[PDB]
């Protein structure tokens, strides 16, 4: 049992996300850590943490049982604090669970930068990509260039052979990078007779450098047609409860990076009828707070329902919330 969240009208892009975030215990602990961290010898006091305390207040209530039977919470307080930051919704496509995830993370970085005299920890969704290039003709490679992410936003590939789509396919499609042409190579010492070794073709190599504690994967199901009309991807992408991320590592080593599914945000319907909804694990009890559960839930604003894993895995995922786990035992 978890408490529901009220939604009169346009607030279910936040309810669905809040049910997903509250299913990531590492994100909750980071908030308890982030909202209580400070430095002793500093002379400036820390800037106030309206968002991270409001977000922690909600997510901690969404990771316990409902405090009175069948209670329904009200997260409108969080809408008000996000408007104290730089954010207002202008159009309908900003009522997006993925857009809000970036509005929240971006605003938590504001709270982090706003207390710069005190060490505040970095949030567990943060990770890095590594750009790299290798010369086809001489195997020489470039220094790495870094890029940062809070979610792996994956474009959904077009069908070649009619095999089912997998999260492996969408992830590889995102990291897979092309051959490049007309590029000078210094190990080849090329251009022309101005050096004396064998314009070349490179291969771009994009892989994962820092893998986050909480991994957010986004399927780009909502896009626009050629001529200004909404395009929705309905194709099922097959995902699993346990996810190996070793095939995407930059570093060539044997240590394993493994993730366990915590929640799935789903988008149902189309225009007028469209709705965001969330599958999530049930939170552990105040006894055994440390041992997570294997009973899933389906949460739709004020409505909460028990769900089977077959139901979660057969859904049409929009956001997949994975959390780093060490070994397979469950």
């Amino acid at each position: 049992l978890v408490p529901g969240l009220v939604n009169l009208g346009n607030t279910c892009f936040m309810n669905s996300l809040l049910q997903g975030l509250s299913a990531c215990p590492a994100f909750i602990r980071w908030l308890e850590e982030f909202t209580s961290q400070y430095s002793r010898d500093q002379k400036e006091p820390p800037s106030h943490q309206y968002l991270s305390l409001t977000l922690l207040h909600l997510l901690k209530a969404l990771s316990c049982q409902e405090v009175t039977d069948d209670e329904v919470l009200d997260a409108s307080c969080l809408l008000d604090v996000l408007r104290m930051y730089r954010w207002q919704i202008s159009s309908f496509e900003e009522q997006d669970a993925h857009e809000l995830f970036h509005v929240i993370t971006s605003s938590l970085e504001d709270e982090r930068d706003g207390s710069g005299s005190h060490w505040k920890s970095q949030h567990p969704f943060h990770g890095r990509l590594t750009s790299n290039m290798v010369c086809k003709h001489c195997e020489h490679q470039s220094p790495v260039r870094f890029d940062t992410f809070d979610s792996l936003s994956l474009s959904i590939p077009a069908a070649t052979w009619g095999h089912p789509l997998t999260l492996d396919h969408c992830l590889h499609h995102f990291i897979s990078s092309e051959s490049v042409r007309d590029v000078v190579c210094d190990n080849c010492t090329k251009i022309e007779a101005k050096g004396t070794l064998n314009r070349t073709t490179f291969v771009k190599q994009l892989k994962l450098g820092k893998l986050p504690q909480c991994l957010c994967i986004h399927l780009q199901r909502l896009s626009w047609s050629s001529h200004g009309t909404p395009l929705k991807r309905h194709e099922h992408v097959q995902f699993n409860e346990d996810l190996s991320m070793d095939e995407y590592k930059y570093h060539s080593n044997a240590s394993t990076y493994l993730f366990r599914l915590m929640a799935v945000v789903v988008h149902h319907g189309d225009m007028h009828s469209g709705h965001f909804v969330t599958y999530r694990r049930s939170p552990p009890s105040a006894r055994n707070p440390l041992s997570t559960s294997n009973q899933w839930l389906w949460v739709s604003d004020d409505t909460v329902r028990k769900a089977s894993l077959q139901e979660v895995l057969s859904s049409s995922a929009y956001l997949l919330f994975y959390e780093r786990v060490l070994e397979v035992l469950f």
Epitope: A159, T160, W161, G162, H163, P164, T166, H169, H172, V203
Partner: antibody
């Protein structure tokens, strides 16, 4: 549930041929369909891909000006047309319809032979 | 185009052996390889998709493995049903090229 195919036949080189494939427990309009060539030395070769719901056809560019892919819904049948044949076109030709739970459906083969 | 290269056109096996058929790709094809089985006088049968996922009715004996450019299909606790031709197929890029095919053979 089968993906049934037309029988074999012989023609002289330089002629032109048509092959057929038909469903039996499904409508071919539901999903993409492929044709592939098979012969023992050069192996399996994909020739093209058709979306029977419309006229969209994607080809291997070695076949693009010589093979031709068509279909009809009411007869539940797709056609492969082959032009200006040579001995190198002597092969077995399969249709294929993909499935997500079962393996993809293949039909019984259609052999094609050309010689004087 | 994608060139799919399997190592050996024939491979020997004991009756209860562990066989691994191998394939090398021209470049990174992601996870997008499928493994087919073909007995003589019959049409192909799809076994694995997305490099490692199985279809319905495919025994636990068949393990798909590999990523990007090198791939292997493994048959462990081999059975007398498994003597056949075995192909790989890439569906990352058009054209949807196949491998050369490995006949796996029974040794005495």
């Amino acid at each position: 549930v089968q993906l049934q195919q037309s029988g074999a036949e012989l023609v002289r080189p330089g002629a032109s041929v048509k092959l057929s494939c038909t469903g039996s427990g499904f409508n071919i309009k539901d999903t993409y369909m492929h044709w592939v060539k098979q012969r023992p030395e050069q192996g399996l070769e994909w020739i093209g891909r058709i979306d029977p719901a419309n006229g969209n056809t994607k080809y291997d560019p070695k076949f693009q000006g010589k093979a031709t892919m068509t279909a009809d819904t009411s007869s539940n049948t797709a056609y492969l047309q082959l032009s200006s044949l040579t001995s190198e076109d002597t092969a077995v030709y399969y249709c294929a319809r993909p499935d997500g739970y079962y393996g993809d459906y293949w039909g019984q083969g259609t052999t094609l032979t050309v010689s004087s | 185009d994608i060139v799919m290269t399997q190592s050996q056109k024939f491979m020997s096996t004991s009756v209860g052996d562990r066989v691994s058929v191998t394939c090398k790709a021209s470049q990174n094809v992601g996870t997008n390889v499928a493994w087919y089985q073909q007995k003589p006088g019959q049409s192909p049968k799809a076994l694995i998709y997305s490099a490692s996922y199985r279809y319905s009715g495919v025994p636990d004996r068949f393990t798909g493995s590999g990523s990007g450019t090198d791939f292997t299909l493994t048959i462990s606790n081999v059975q007398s049903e498994d003597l056949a031709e075995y192909f790989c197929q890439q569906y990352n890029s058009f054209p949807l090229t196949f491998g050369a095919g490995t006949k796996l053979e029974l040794k005495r």
